Amino acid sequence: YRHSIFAFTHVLIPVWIIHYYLKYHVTTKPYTIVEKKPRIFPGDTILETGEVIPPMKEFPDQHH
Amino acid sequence: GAHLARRYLGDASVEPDPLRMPTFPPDYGFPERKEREMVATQQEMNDAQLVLQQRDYCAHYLIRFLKCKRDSFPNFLACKHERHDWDYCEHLDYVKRMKEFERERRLLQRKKRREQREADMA
Amino acid sequence: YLTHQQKVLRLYKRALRHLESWCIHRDKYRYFACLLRARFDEHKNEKDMVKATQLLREAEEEFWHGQHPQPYIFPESPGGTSYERYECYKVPEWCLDDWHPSEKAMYPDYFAKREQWKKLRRESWEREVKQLQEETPVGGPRTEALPPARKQGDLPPLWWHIVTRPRERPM
Amino acid sequence: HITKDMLPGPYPKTPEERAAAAKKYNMRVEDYEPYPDDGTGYGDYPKLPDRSQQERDPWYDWDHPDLRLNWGEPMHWDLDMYIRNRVDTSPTPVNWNLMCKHLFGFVAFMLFMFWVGETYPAYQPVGPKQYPYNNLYLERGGDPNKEPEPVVHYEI
Amino acid sequence: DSWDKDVYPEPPRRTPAPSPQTSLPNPITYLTKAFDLLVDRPVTLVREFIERQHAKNKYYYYHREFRRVPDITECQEKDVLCMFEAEMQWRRDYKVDQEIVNIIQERLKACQQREGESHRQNCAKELEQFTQVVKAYQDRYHDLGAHYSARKCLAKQKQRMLAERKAAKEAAAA
Amino acid sequence: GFILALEISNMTKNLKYHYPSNAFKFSTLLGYFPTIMHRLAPYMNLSMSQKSASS
Amino acid sequence: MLKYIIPTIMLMPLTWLSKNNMIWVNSTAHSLLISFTSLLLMNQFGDNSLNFSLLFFSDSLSTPLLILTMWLLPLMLMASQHHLSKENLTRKKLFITMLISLQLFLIMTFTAMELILFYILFEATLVPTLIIITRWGNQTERLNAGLYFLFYTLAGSLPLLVALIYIQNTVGSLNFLMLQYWVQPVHNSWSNVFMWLACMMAFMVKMPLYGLHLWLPKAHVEAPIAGSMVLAAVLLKLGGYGMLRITLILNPMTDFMAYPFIMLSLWGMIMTSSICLRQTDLKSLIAYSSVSHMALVIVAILIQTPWSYMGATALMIAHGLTSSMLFCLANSNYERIHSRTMILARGLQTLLPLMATWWLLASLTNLALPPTINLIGELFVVMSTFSWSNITIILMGVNMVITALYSLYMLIMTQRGKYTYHINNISPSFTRENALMSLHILPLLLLTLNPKIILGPLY
Amino acid sequence: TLCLGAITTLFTAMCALTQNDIKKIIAFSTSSQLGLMMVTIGINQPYLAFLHICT
Amino acid sequence: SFPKYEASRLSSLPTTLDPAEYDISSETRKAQAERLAIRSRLKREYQLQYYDPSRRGVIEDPALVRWTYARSANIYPNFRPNTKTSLLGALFGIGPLVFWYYVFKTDRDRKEKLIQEGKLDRTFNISY
Amino acid sequence: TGFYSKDLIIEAANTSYTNAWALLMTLIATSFTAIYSTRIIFFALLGQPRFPTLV
Amino acid sequence: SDAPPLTLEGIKDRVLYVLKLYDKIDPEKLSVNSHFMKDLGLDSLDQVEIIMAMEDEFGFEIPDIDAEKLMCPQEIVDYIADKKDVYE
Amino acid sequence: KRLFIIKPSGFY
Ligand SMILES: C[C@H](CCC(=O)O)[C@H]1CC[C@H]2[C@@H]3[C@H](O)C[C@@H]4C[C@H](O)CC[C@]4(C)[C@H]3C[C@H](O)[C@]12C
Ligand SMILES: *C(=O)CCCCCCCCCCCCC
Ligand SMILES: [Zn+2]
């Protein structure tokens, strides 16, 4: 009960305020939140357009 | 290492100069050396956000390793197979640098021998 | 000043503690503590004040050259890691006169006793002044020692702050 | 409400004045030593030993324990500098002159050795790192309009 | 939309599709599901309630427009009534020019963060545009001083035109 | 270092006197850097502030 | 400005016609309302200043100084109540009258549009200031302090009058708006060198400039608390405000005539900061602290860069609140022990726990702890002076070190340590004193959230 | 930075070989550890230096 | 036997090693009687007021007042302009001003040329 | 925890173009770390209790 | 800081408990009101080290000015108790 | 055995 109340008035209400703040006041202005572009690796699938990058060139198989 | 004495407490031309290597031409000494290739491509390395110092011939194994880390999360006690592939390729690349160094070290002595012989006799 | 007996006594205490610092281990300290005592035992009495000073001056020079650079210090002594650590918690008693009545009412017993001390302190002050101007030469006192009360029911002169001083660990 | 006859005055000329000054400052006429009459505005203020308050008897019942002063005692001209927070003039285990030599010697030795180690670097035997695509010309921001000076590395 | 995409460009995102290989469940996905329910939902409803209240009362504010007036060049010497309007116009342009540089700087910094490690190459139209505008801004407004004015701005230009005009004459003669 | 530390540490238990090495007092007093700088620079600065700057 | 001039004048009838025991309640209550209405001056535009009439105007420079000036009068009334407790009723009313008239001249000085109207009101502030020091000061030295204050200012002001009247004859006007358009460059001749000096030395003596400051330790120490608060907070800023205006008509001669004055200020920072480390008087230590912060203002006005003027404006407002608070804090102790010696009372943090929190906050702002506006103004001046010359970073840096030392030296000397045994009359802080300290620090810290309103015209 | 760390990672460790106070001994360990971090920065290994902070 | 102690300005001579604490003549000990005699008299005067229960305020210490009055208000009346005061004043007062003027004037004259000639890098410098 | 950062640093320091004297001090300091580290254990854990009787 | 306080009985017991471990006084003849120089026949140098063993027991130094005034075990109890504010 | 802790007046 003590932790439930603490997790409500210190982790749940503040995140509501922050998420409401970020989602509807900060993200509505240019470049306020800038996220580094996700890394794309050879042989992936893009969710936005379905593109399938070619896997790779064949490797000179090694060992050890 | 062990050649610092040979660079300071000994002869100079015997030991190469790291800031200026390579000194001799890139072909003289071998029968048409095969140009080192690169499995990865610029567009692929650019899209993987590899650090610039990692944009070497050893790439295309780091790219494989990075995919395993993202595709195995959370399995940080795994993907060790790809770790050695990139590490091993890095190990071979370092050997070539020593092989480049050893080549330079001898050719300087060979230049010493040729100059010494022609100079001493005349 | 400090006579000649006291200087050797002070030097002996310092020498052991500095020696105790070098030795660390108790068994070594006991072995050397008695050895250093013997070197004092050799030259006990011996009269010849002129030669007595020479032995002490040589002793002080030897102590200075061999003293520990970082002698052990008691935690609550000048130089210690806990010296004056509680001076910030020591509040005088005259501040209680400035308390608000609403917070004196939290301690009806304590301030009842204070009135007795304050009442006691006022009544005894006049005698303390008399006790001091009678037991003092014409040219003012020549020592910092104070006389006790030469009577029953008379408190010693100048006792209020000595008695009522803050406790060593007030909080 | 202190009168002008109980306040510091000019340098005493006759021995009689030096007697009044010593009595004024609560000192023995023998111990009362005015500062030199060099004209820096010292007047007849007593010159006390340049001993910090940190080297006063910690156990004596001072009227001002933190300042190590006694009520009515003549204060040193530089008392504020010699309080127990600022300047310590206590004897040290090592002589002052010997301390400076050791500290300067250590720093002087160390600085020279760093310079020696700067002109004689330690490095493992390896050729310069080789990178593809004209040594990462395009990756390092090189403009893709001017032709880069070609660079080629060969296997070996 | 919230802002004009032309002024503040944004390369399209490319989020790779998840391709898990380990059998373990990714905790982030579960936390994402929980977050969408305990945080994203209640916030969305409260905003929608407030959003509707802003549709019942809808009043508008407008971007002030200042019609151009004669610049300091056409102002008669020591004519305050003409110099005043030109000076006031110049100051507004000065503030506008300051914000234009801020826009280009913001685009430059967004690119350096959007492109990650590959920012030195992928950010070339941003660095170039920033360099050009700063050079333009510096020539217009720099070294004027705290008591800057249209008159001081004009004199700086005229000395740059003379310096550049003389250089052209020397080059032309060759 | 552990081997050197252990044997040197054990010597403290050998019943015997010692010598006051200067290199020991150099490290005990932190190279004398505090004793000099924290006693000289305050004196110079605080003497100048009163004799030159003010008086 | 008649919406502020007239009500200030009405504070005089209010004080004299009020009940005998209610003089402090009405003047404090109604002067606070005048301060509230001063917030209407913030109707500032990006291109044009707020010009009211032919006589008065208010740009972003005058506005923060006006709001500050009208905010101090209620504060100075609170600080004066204790030491005027046994004062004759009529004389007590004459004291409140001097403070009201001083505000009346200040609010007309900062808003005057014509430079001779500025001079008359700029010079008129001496009479109410001189009377407060010489009449309601404590020590014998007030008389000599009054003479030093009077004749240092006039020795500079009188040449300024000859220069101002000369400029009108040549230019035909002294209206500040006119000068912005009719200004002409100043040729390098011996005649103009002395015009430059006459237009600045009056303002330099009031900043004050190092070398010409041997009235601030006398006036700011021998004056009553109300005199010290206004002397330090608003009267030093008249010289700063004057220079920020008259440098408009001195270009380009300010390029080389500023060197001897930048050196005095740059090296005057260290000299005055060092003096604070050895002061045996809590009020004199705070007074010398003003000469160091105003030395940054002189350098900021003499290099003429957009950042320097923004830094100069912020510094003047920040210093006014901090210095006024420091004098108030030093006075609260003096009202108990009735002595200015800094070492007499120690360890006061054990007897006045809350008043020691006000000491800490005042010291933190004094040493320019970010993000307080003291740091914002000081930082913007180091940035500007760095571009003026990269070597100035050395002198700016050393002063920041010494500034922290003497600020915390007085905090440690008077708050920490061990209480003086024979000091047994340290009564708890009154609500008046605590409210007095809050009314300084709270607005000073709130300005950090919206600092653009104190950055001046070049924002 | 390489030399600045090296002097600190050595001088402060040297001062710790003879300190008695338990807190002071651990303090001189921090300075030596910080000096090592500076050496890491001096050899162009910023991420190793960051890792040393966390560990 | 052992090396002597070298006393410096910031390192006083230890009282034990001072060759005056051992020998105690008739007059030398008599002086220490007066020092303790006077200083014990003040200790008495202080304690009379200190312990008094009918005293509330500050025990004014005339020694403290004389200290501050000598440090601030008694300096100028005891000042004589002579070789030391004049030479020290000129060096400390005017020397630094002249030294700093040439450091900054020389620095700014050099920097001014590099800007007129276009040899100073100011590509992105638009904040002054 | 220390191994995964400190050891990697020393390997990179040794095998990198670097100041020779600075590298030496780093290696010496690591040895000096063990000496004062052991000083704590011996004088606090090992040996016999040197603290007062009533504890 | 969690250290149990000191009582008058506890102080007296420890003062004698340390002297009784001293190989210079007869335990049977050792009384609280027993001098050190006039009853038990001890030299001043022995007295000085009496304090050191006394200080190391209570863990706090005694001034040398006030150290050379404790000639009876009862006086030690008075000094140690008074310094540490022990009343019952 | 609770003792009285002397503090300055915290009411004001
Ligand atoms: C949760 C925590 C400890 C619980 C535990 O025993 O594990 C307890 C200790 C004291 C409590 C806090 C105190 O009661 C003070 C606050 C008042 C209310 O209790 C709710 C929030 C509040 C902040 C509490 C949150 C939580 O219940 C706390 C923080
Ligand atoms: C080359 O870069 C070596 C530089 C010195 C670092 C290694 C020093 C320690 C060598 C110990 C092994 C020596 C061979 C017995
Ligand atoms: Zn009062």
Tab-separated table of N, CA and C in Angstrom, chain C residues 64 67-70 76-78 83-84 144, chain D residues 58-61 65-66 68 84 91-93:
chain	number	residue	atom	x	y	z
C	64	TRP	N	63.062	16.418	18.269
C	64	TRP	CA	62.625	17.128	17.073
C	64	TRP	C	63.090	16.423	15.807
C	67	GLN	N	60.915	13.036	15.734
C	67	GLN	CA	59.472	13.032	15.918
C	67	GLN	C	58.777	12.507	14.669
C	68	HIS	N	57.620	11.897	14.869
C	68	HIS	CA	56.849	11.391	13.744
C	68	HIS	C	56.271	12.563	12.954
C	69	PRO	N	56.389	12.573	11.624
C	69	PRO	CA	55.780	13.672	10.858
C	69	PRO	C	54.273	13.755	11.020
C	70	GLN	N	53.601	12.625	11.233
C	70	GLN	CA	52.146	12.564	11.359
C	70	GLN	C	51.784	11.800	12.627
C	76	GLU	N	39.265	13.690	19.500
C	76	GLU	CA	38.615	14.857	20.081
C	76	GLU	C	39.615	15.802	20.742
C	77	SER	N	40.832	15.862	20.221
C	77	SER	CA	41.873	16.746	20.716
C	77	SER	C	42.374	17.636	19.588
C	78	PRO	N	42.961	18.795	19.913
C	78	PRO	CA	43.442	19.700	18.862
C	78	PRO	C	44.208	18.980	17.767
C	83	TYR	N	37.560	17.069	16.450
C	83	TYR	CA	37.767	18.221	17.317
C	83	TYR	C	36.765	19.308	16.953
C	84	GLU	N	35.968	19.729	17.932
C	84	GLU	CA	34.931	20.738	17.745
C	84	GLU	C	33.832	20.269	16.799
C	144	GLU	N	44.870	33.462	37.924
C	144	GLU	CA	43.554	33.153	37.388
C	144	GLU	C	42.780	32.163	38.246
D	58	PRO	N	46.017	25.545	22.850
D	58	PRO	CA	44.625	25.120	22.632
D	58	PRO	C	43.852	24.858	23.910
D	59	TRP	N	44.527	24.563	25.022
D	59	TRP	CA	43.837	24.149	26.236
D	59	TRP	C	43.563	25.296	27.197
D	60	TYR	N	44.293	26.402	27.090
D	60	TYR	CA	44.046	27.531	27.973
D	60	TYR	C	42.627	28.049	27.778
D	61	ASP	N	42.014	28.497	28.873
D	61	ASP	CA	40.616	28.926	28.869
D	61	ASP	C	40.532	30.325	28.266
D	65	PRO	N	37.500	31.257	22.356
D	65	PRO	CA	38.226	30.017	22.035
D	65	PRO	C	38.595	29.884	20.570
D	66	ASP	N	37.712	30.293	19.659
D	66	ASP	CA	38.004	30.138	18.238
D	66	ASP	C	39.096	31.101	17.790
D	68	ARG	N	41.364	32.326	19.914
D	68	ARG	CA	42.508	32.163	20.808
D	68	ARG	C	42.974	33.512	21.347
D	84	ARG	N	42.613	31.352	12.770
D	84	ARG	CA	42.837	29.928	12.568
D	84	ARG	C	42.308	29.418	11.244
D	91	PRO	N	55.525	25.634	13.538
D	91	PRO	CA	56.721	24.910	13.097
D	91	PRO	C	56.356	23.638	12.349
D	92	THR	N	57.181	23.296	11.360
D	92	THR	CA	56.945	22.123	10.537
D	92	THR	C	57.996	21.049	10.808
D	93	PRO	N	57.675	19.775	10.568
D	93	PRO	CA	58.683	18.723	10.777
D	93	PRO	C	59.947	18.931	9.964
